[PDB]
Structures are given as structure tokens and as C-alpha cells.
């Protein structure tokens, strides 16, 4: 049974190492969510600092890949940082060679191709991570593109990743069935973040403090992460209505 150790086909036509890499994705026990506004793309993720000895400022699963592109990871931090470093290098190289900023969907495809190679080449293992890329693309507008250990990728109206992804997914599905549009009809990104947090609270059924969340926001020509105080202001606005 060495067909379960390396990335070769089983008799069923399956790749067990790829499937087990998908299971490593949930090892952190963190849930992430991404939604699109009119002028922005918002990504939120649970933040868990179990040890008091940890410096909580360094505990993060959101990465600034380029000025325009942000990335949240679902999976162990070593593989997450491996993927982050590569994406940063690829984004920088793209700009140098082709004279313009790498689009979110193109980076997603590139990283998905690299992941595909690990599913086909035996000496390289898959990374046990799911990568959710976000930006406000200059051509396509607000963009969410997600990559997995199979080398699969696709664009999203909104998405969720983690142990309780299905609960979040259905919650988002039901909202877009009502509104009948492909985004959150809202002017300011602040209110889009409030929507994202509100619907995660409703789906998971848990309340959040400022230190329980981690937020990333993509606008035209820049991506940035919110501080604990910026999130606190966001949580106050939700509670007051």
C-alpha cells in the first residue's frame, strides 16, 4: 500500500496524499470568510491565541502578498508561510517582467499550477493549506479566488473556509438568494466588514471580542489589515444596532 504514501493513483483513481493534505487544512481549527462590496473585498478570520506566553501581534494567518493582493490561509503556519513567500516572489517577478501589477486571479492560477505539480511529481509533497486570494482588480473589480492542495481554483462571489465552512457557506448562500446580486451593496468598506463579522457571528453562533478576530481589506490600489482598535470600532457599531 505505497499508493497512499506518494502522489500516484490508487485503483479507485484517487490521490490519497492530496486528500490527506485537505485534512491538514483544518488542523489549526480556524474559520475564514471572504465577501465582496461595491468598491472593496473584505476577508475575516478567527484569531486564537491559546498560550499567554505568545506575542499576539505575531500570530496571524493573513498575508500582504503585494500592494494590491492579500492572502488568508487555512492550514498549518509553516506551509502557510511557504506559500506566502512564494506568492510574494511570483507577484514581484510578474511586475518586473510584464510591466504591470499581477492580477489576483492570475496569481491564484500560478499558485494552483504549482500545487498541481506537487500532486503529479512524487518527490514534492502537497502543501496542507487552502489559499484565499483577495483584491480589487483594475479590470475585474472586487475579486476572491481560492486555491487548494488538489491544484483546483475558482473565482467566488463570496466564500468560507475551515472546520465550520458549511454553516458559513449556507448562511451566505441564503443572503444572496434574497438580495439577488453578486455582492454586498454597500459604499464604505467599514460597513462591508461589519456585514462579514455579523454573518460569521450568526453562522457560528459565537460572540467576538477585538482579539478574537483578524480582518483584511482590499481597496483600489492597496490591501491592508485592521488593528485590534479598528476591529473594536467595528464591533461597537454592530452592537449599537
Amino acid at each position: 500500500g505505497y499508493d497512499r504514501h506518494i502522489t500516484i493513483f490508487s485503483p479507485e483513481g484517487r490521490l490519497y496524499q492530496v486528500e490527506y493534505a485537505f485534512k491538514a487544512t483544518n488542523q489549526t481549527n480556524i474559520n475564514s470568510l471572504a465577501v465582496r462590496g461595491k468598491d472593496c473585498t473584505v476577508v475575516i478570520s478567527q484569531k486564537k491565541v491559546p498560550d499567554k506566553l505568545l506575542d499576539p501581534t505575531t500570530v496571524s494567518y493573513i498575508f500582504c502578498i503585494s500592494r494590491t493582493i492579500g492572502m488568508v490561509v487555512n492550514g498549518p503556519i509553516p506551509d502557510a508561510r511557504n506559500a506566502a513567500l512564494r506568492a510574494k516572489a511570483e507577484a514581484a517577478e510578474f511586475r518586473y517582467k510584464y510591466g504591470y501589477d499581477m492580477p489576483c486571479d492570475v496569481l491564484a492560477k500560478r499558485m494552483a499550477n504549482l500545487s498541481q505539480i506537487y500532486t503529479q511529481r512524487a518527490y514534492m509533497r502537497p502543501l496542507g493549506v487552502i489559499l484565499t486570494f483577495v483584491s480589487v482588480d483594475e479590470e475585474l473589480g472586487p475579486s476572491i479566488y481560492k486555491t487548494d492542495p488538489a491544484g483546483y481554483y475558482v473565482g467566488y462571489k463570496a466564500t468560507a473556509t475551515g472546520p465550520k465552512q458549511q454553516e458559513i457557506t449556507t448562511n451566505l448562500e441564503n443572503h444572496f438568494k434574497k438580495s439577488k446580486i453578486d455582492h454586498i451593496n454597500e459604499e464604505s468598506w467599514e460597513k462591508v466588514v461589519e456585514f462579514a463579522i455579523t454573518h460569521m457571528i450568526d453562522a457560528l453562533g459565537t460572540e467576538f471580542s477585538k482579539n478574537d478576530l483578524e480582518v483584511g481589506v482590499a481597496t483600489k490600489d492597496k490591501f491592508f489589515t485592521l488593528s485590534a482598535e479598528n476591529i473594536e470600532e467595528r464591533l461597537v457599531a454592530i452592537a449599537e444596532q
Binding site: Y100, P103, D105, E139
Partner: protein, 226 residues
């Protein structure tokens, strides 16, 4: 060679003469110096003919693969970047002097490229041995907010100045117009101010004038059946 590029209201126009020379001899009277990198990105080339053709084909090929890879229409800055880095690497030995123009989702663009890999930005540009004659016209008649009709006129006039005054340029004027939100129109032989006059005499010889030694049929067909 005289090649020019002129920006206008809603796009950009490039133009070129059609003379190729080897020393003091004209190799080709109706040479095509306007090259297609992509459907809406065209460039005019001066210098070594094989180089301008080859470097345009290579970058045009990679631009096409890039467009398919990214699911986006190609940009002029991408062609510019790929051309300059290729030419820089070869330290000027690839003798391609290019005026690169086009329209893309960012807008309309006009650049020049020299063999050593340096790029320049402008509203009007000229390259080649007739560039001084062409630039004299451009510097005398160019203005901001040109229309499509005015830009074609100015571009072709600049080429004509090269055709008449530069011995390295001649024959016809080729033009390509690239307007925003429209198909690029390639105007091959836009002007033809150098048609040769009728000859005084016909030099058709009487049949049997040349002395022959042998005759034979040449077998061009494949090996036959039966």
C-alpha cells in the same frame, strides 16, 4: 528608414516608409515595416530588418501566450517591457529600433525603443535615418488635442519628409491606426507617390533569341504507382 508615431484624441497612429537598402542599393521597394505584436498593439521597426521582424515575432508570440494565460487583452507596457529586456540582454547587437504603439484596457499608448534597450515616452516620435526630416515636420505642425484625421495627415507628412529628403527612405507610406474601443485598421500603402513612369520601349525578346544547349523535364512529382 523613416518611422513615426503620433498620439491623438482617442488613440494613436504609427506610420513608415517602405524602402529597404543594402548600402547604396535598394533591396526592396515595397517593404513592410509595420509589424503586428497583437491585434491592437502594432510597432514600426528601423535598423536591421531581420532583427525587427524576429524580435517582434518572438515578443508577439509570448504576448499571445500571456494573453491566453491571464484571460486578458495584452497591454503595450508588457510588450515594451519584454522588448527592452530582450534587447538590453543582447547589448545592442540585435539592431532593432522600434516605435511601439497600441490600445488596451488601460488606454492608448506610444513608446520608442532603441537597440540597447532604452525606452522613451512621447506624444510624437520618429526613428531611423529619416527621423530628422520627419521630426522637423512633427516639431513644426504638431499640437495637443489632434483629431484622428489630423494625426494621420501629420504622420504621413512626416514620412513623406523622410521619403523625399532622406536617401535611406523612399517609395510608399504605410499607416496603422489604433483607436480606443475599435478594431485597429492597418492601411497598407496608404500613399503611393512614387509609381514608376511607363518605359519608352518594350524589351520583350523574339522567341529563340537565347542560345540553348540541353532541355529536360524535371520530375517534381512523387514516385508513381504501377
Amino acid at each position: 528608414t523613416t518611422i513615426v508615431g503620433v498620439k491623438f484624441n482617442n488613440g494613436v497612429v504609427i506610420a513608415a516608409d517602405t524602402r529597404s537598402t543594402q548600402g547604396p542599393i535598394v533591396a526592396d521597394k515595397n517593404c513592410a515595416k509595420l509589424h503586428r505584436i497583437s491585434p491592437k498593439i502594432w510597432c514600426a521597426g528601423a535598423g536591421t530588418a531581420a532583427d525587427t521582424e524576429a524580435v517582434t515575432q518572438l515578443i508577439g508570440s509570448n504576448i499571445e501566450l500571456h494573453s491566453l494565460y491571464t484571460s486578458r487583452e495584452p497591454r503595450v507596457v508588457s510588450a515594451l517591457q519584454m522588448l527592452k529586456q530582450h534587447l538590453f540582454k543582447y547589448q545592442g547587437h540585435i539592431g532593432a529600433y522600434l516605435i511601439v504603439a497600441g490600445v488596451d484596457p488601460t488606454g492608448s499608448h506610444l513608446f520608442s525603443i532603441h537597440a540597447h534597450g532604452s525606452t522613451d515616452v512621447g506624444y510624437y516620435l520618429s526613428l531611423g535615418s529619416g527621423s530628422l526630416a520627419a521630426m522637423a515636420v512633427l516639431e513644426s505642425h504638431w499640437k495637443q488635442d489632434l483629431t484622428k484625421e489630423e494625426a494621420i495627415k501629420l504622420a504621413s507628412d512626416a514620412i513623406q519628409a523622410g521619403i523625399w529628403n532622406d536617401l535611406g527612405s523612399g517609395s510608399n507610406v504605410d499607416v496603422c491606426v489604433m483607436e480606443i474601443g475599435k478594431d485597429a485598421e492597418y492601411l497598407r500603402n496608404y500613399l503611393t507617390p512614387n509609381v514608376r513612369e511607363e518605359k519608352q520601349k518594350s524589351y520583350k525578346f523574339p522567341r529563340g533569341t537565347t542560345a540553348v544547349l540541353k532541355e529536360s523535364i524535371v520530375n517534381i512529382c512523387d514516385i508513381q504507382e504501377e
